[PDB]
From Swiss-Prot:
Designated name of the protein: Endothiapepsin
List of catalytic residues: D35, S199
Molecular-function GO term, any one: aspartic-type endopeptidase activity
Disulfide-bonded cysteines: C255-C290
Organism: Cryphonectria parasitica (Chestnut blight fungus)
Complete-protein stretch covered: 90 to 419 of 419
């Protein structure tokens, strides 16, 4: 089997991407944030505290003939941005882009933090990291990809995120028309439950490439590119007027700037992030100070290849017995 679904930016800044997901019988379609940095499939629901719902589409298990309460199971998750959610668990039929999993754990939110409530466009998350991070207790549950894997033509999914435009998540096949040149594959460590890999270095603009190992995670659920302070300082030093602002919470730059590209290494290959991808616009409406798309990972504890980086590539998440990651230009 295979699946193919279009993923669409939630706003003009590509702050996140939503992909339609069919849950239950008859289908209830919710727009979920596919997140390769977590492993819970959770949704706004009929059980969510009413004051914490503001425009989201909810899953109502009682209206699904295939929904079954997973008795005794609860979940609770906290994300890197400080947001969180928790609730109980149903199993139900879940389909993405024509690919169907029966008995998928669907984590129903009883509580969500303000960031989720305030984002009307995201109806929940679909985790695509390794199932060892799944928060369901007392019986840990598998991700959608893990459940689908055996049925897929090939044990892979691909992320093809757009810049200011729709893209695609495919399951079970590599669309050879979706990228240019070759795909370069690189080793993955699953020791922390993430798609963790080591970039071979970077360049700023038309500058020379610096060979240096940068361990980080491929995380579709994180907006920006978070790298070591040395790397980030070298980037922003090429933008006149750029500075790190503690009051804003990162590097800002004059909105009148033309930003240089940023290149990262994948083995001997190179992925180029155009400068425009690194512009996240005014810090506040009407401001001429703009927020940077490359920020320091210092104090996160991990480097994160978020959407800024991933959307410059066609990315293969290879879930073979020994997982690997593939990157191609596009």
């Amino acid at each position: 089997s295979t699946g193919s679904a279009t993923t669409t930016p939630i706003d003009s800044l590509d702050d996140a991407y939503i992909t339609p997901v069919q849950i239950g019988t008859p289908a209830q379609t919710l727009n979920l944030d596919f997140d390769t940095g977590s492993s819970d499939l959770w949704v706004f629901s009929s059980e969510t505290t009413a004051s914490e719902v503001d425009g989201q589409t909810i899953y109502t298990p009682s209206k699904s003939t295939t929904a079954k309460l997973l008795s005794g199971a609860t979940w609770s998750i906290s994300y890197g941005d400080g947001s969180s959610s928790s609730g109980d668990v149903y199993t139900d039929t879940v389909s993405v882009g024509g690919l169907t999993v029966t008995g998928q754990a669907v984590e129903s939110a009883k509580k969500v933090s303000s960031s989720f409530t305030e984002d009307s466009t995201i109806d929940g998350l679909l985790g695509l990291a390794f199932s060892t991070l799944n928060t369901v207790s007392p019986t840990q549950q598998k991700t959608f990809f893990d459940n689908a894997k055996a049925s897929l033509d090939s044990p892979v999914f691909t992320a093809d995120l757009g810049y200011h435009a729709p893209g695609t998540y495919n399951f079970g096949f590599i669309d050879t028309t979706a990228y240019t040149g070759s795909i370069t594959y690189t080793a993955v460590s699953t020791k922390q439950g993430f798609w963790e890999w080591t970039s071979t270095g970077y360049a700023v603009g038309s500058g020379t490439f610096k060979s240096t190992s940068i361990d980080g995670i491929a995380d579709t659920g994180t907006t920006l590119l978070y790298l070591p302070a040395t790397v980030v300082s070298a980037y922003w030093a090429q933008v006149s007027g750029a500075k790190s602002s503690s009051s804003v919470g990162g590097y800002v730059f004059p909105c009148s700037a033309t930003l240089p590209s940023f290149t990262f290494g994948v083995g001997s290959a190179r992925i180029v992030i155009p400068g425009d991808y690194i512009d996240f616009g005014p810090i506040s409406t009407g401001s001429s100070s703009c927020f940077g798309g490359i920020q320091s990972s210092a104090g996160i504890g991990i480097n994160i290849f978020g959407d800024v980086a991933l959307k410059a590539a066609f990315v293969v998440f290879n879930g073979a017995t020994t997982p690997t990651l593939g990157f191609a230009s596009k």
